[PDB]
């Protein structure tokens, strides 16, 4: 769960293809089962892959299990990184969980106090507006 930064753009492609593509970029050797799912659409910018993966899982796709050398996977939206300069990322977690409800979309907290969101643009926009708005009362030190 650490990698080079990437931009994932997938327009109506088999998750098996996204997976292989992700193995061809040295993000492990990835192998699915045979019939995992189908086709998905995602479009990410500035996301390390191992995350764009966790995030792909949550879209439609699978869960991942690693043997070590190989990993087995079994059965636009966008991603944007939000810097949080002023506040701690965990203090947002209550409010951010409360927008999601039983929706799709997710939020991932990276160690360097940045939030990452996959979702529809409309749920991304909401999550950014709240994260920045709460960050903004934190900059008045």
């Amino acid at each position: 769960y650490r990698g080079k930064r990437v931009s994932f753009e997938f327009k109506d492609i088999d998750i098996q293809n996204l997976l292989r593509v992700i193995a061809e970029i040295s993000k492990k050797n990835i192998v699915v089962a045979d019939d995992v799912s189908g086709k998905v659409t995602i479009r990410l910018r500035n996301v390390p892959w191992d995350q764009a993966l966790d995030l792909v899982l949550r879209t439609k796709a699978l869960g991942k299990e690693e043997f070590g050398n190989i990993i087995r996977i079994a059965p636009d939206l966008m991603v944007n990184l939000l810097p949080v300069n002023y506040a701690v990322a965990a203090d947002m977690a209550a409010r951010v969980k409360d927008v999601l409800s039983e929706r799709g979309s997710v939020t991932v907290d990276q160690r360097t106090n940045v939030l990452i969101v996959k979702d529809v643009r409309s749920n991304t926009e909401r999550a950014r507006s709240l994260v920045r708005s709460l960050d903004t009362q934190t900059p008045q030190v």
Binding site: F67, G68, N69, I70
Partner: protein, 57 residues
């Protein structure tokens, strides 16, 4: 006359795996280190895990 009594089929056989496979086929999985000395963990082209350490082959 021999089955009614006691039966063992002793080990003396082959079983000696990575010296039957080429070195560039093997992949480093992990490494362990502690008071018991450092040990490497490596994967076969047959997908077995092994554990080997300094002075071993």
């Amino acid at each position: 006359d021999e089955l009614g009594p006691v039966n063992a089929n002793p080990v003396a056989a082959c079983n000696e795996p990575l010296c039957s496979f080429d070195l560039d086929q093997l992949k480093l999985v992990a490494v362990v280190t502690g008071d018991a000395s450092p040990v490497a963990m490596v994967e076969d082209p047959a997908g077995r895990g092994h554990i080997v350490r300094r002075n071993t082959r």
